[PDB]
Amino acid sequence: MTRQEELAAARAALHDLMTGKRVATVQKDGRRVEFTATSVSDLKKYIAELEVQTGMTQ
């Protein structure tokens, strides 16, 4: 129902990784999101997709 939200929260850290955060690492039911302040940009796109996927069922 709403599993992409958890890491989408990780996105929150990720967008922060760009400045505040530094390294995000989460566990999902299909893929893994482990990133730092080097690929977080490319990741933010991936996580951004994730984000938009959040609350897929409301």
The C-alpha atoms of residue 47 and residue 58 are separated, in whole angstroms, by 19
Q: Domain holding 43: CATH number?
A: 3.30.1580.10
Looking at the DSSP bridge assignments, the partners of residue 24 are 35
Q: Which domain holds residue 25?
A: 1-58
The C-alpha atoms of residue 15 and residue 44 are separated, in whole angstroms, by 7
Token couple for 50: 């994730």
User: How far lies 37's CA from each of 12, 15, 17, 47, 58, in Å?
Assistant: 14, 10, 6, 14, 31
Number of domains in the chain: 1
